[PDB]
């Protein structure tokens, strides 16, 4: 049942056993055929996959640094061992992304009925194609980068048309889209322009706020500034 698996997902979260949280939410999604996940369920699913992928991304990064350092020292035996270990982490990364992408393409995106949900899931699709682009090479990298740009640019079209410039989902899309430009496409100018644009469009309607609603918007907008601060001084 949907209720039971949501509860198990909350138990896994508390226990920080995120691989099992993914499974419980994977079963929540299966129990919700055609209908949309609740905001709560939608957020639990993303918290479940973010941590799971977050750990492997962390591992992959630290392992890559070690590989390069060992390459600089000439330890071929160490480099060989590191590459096989990195390849194992990359296999997990591929499987984690494939799991959420399979769910996004076949169930979540097709069922999204509001502009809110449409910009959330497409954004998530771009996020996890972006994670693939972080480590893939060759044709698989370009295929992942293009799927990211397609999903982000699509999500952008709906966001500009149906979401306020201060909406957290829209701001999050602009932040991640700008990161995509800087890191994956190595286009710093396009990254800065998008981050500033999304920020300027927000501050224009920011003062038309409540008191406890722009807590989430101010958080994303500060990240946009921080990235701009780093990108502007090289």
């Amino acid at each position: 049942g949907r209720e039971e698996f949501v509860y198990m997902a909350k138990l896994a979260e508390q226990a920080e056993r995120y691989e099992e949280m993914v499974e419980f939410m994977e079963k929540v999604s299966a129990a919700v055929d055609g209908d949309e996940l609740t905001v709560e369920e939608r957020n639990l699913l993303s918290v479940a996959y973010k941590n799971v992928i977050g750990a492997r991304r962390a591992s992959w990064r630290i392992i890559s640094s070690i590989e390069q350092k060992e390459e600089s020292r000439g330890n071929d035996d160490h480099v060989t061992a590191i590459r096989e270990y990195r390849s194992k982490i990359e296999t997990e990364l591929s499987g984690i992304c494939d799991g959420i992408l399979k769910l996004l393409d076949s169930r979540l995106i097709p069922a999204a009925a509001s502009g809110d949900s449409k910009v959330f899931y497409l954004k998530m699709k771009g996020d996890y194609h972006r994670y693939l682009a972080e480590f893939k090479t060759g044709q698989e990298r370009k295929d992942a980068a293009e799927h990211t740009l397609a999903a982000y640019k699509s999500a952008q079209d709906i966001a500009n048309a149906e979401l306020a410039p201060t909406h957290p989902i829209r701001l999050g899309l602009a932040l991640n889209f700008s990161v995509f430009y800087y890191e994956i496409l190595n286009s710093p100018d396009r990254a800065c322009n998008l981050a500033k644009q999304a920020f300027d469009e927000a501050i224009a309607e920011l003062d038309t706020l409540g008191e406890e609603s722009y807590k989430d918007s101010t958080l994303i907008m500060q990240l946009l500034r921080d990235n701009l601060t780093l990108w502007t001084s090289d």
């Binding site: 996020d127 701001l171 999050g172 932040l175 990161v179 890191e183 994303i220 990240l223």
Partner: peptide, 6 residues
Amino acid sequence: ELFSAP
């Protein structure tokens, strides 16, 4: 040390 969305 860049930041993506939470």
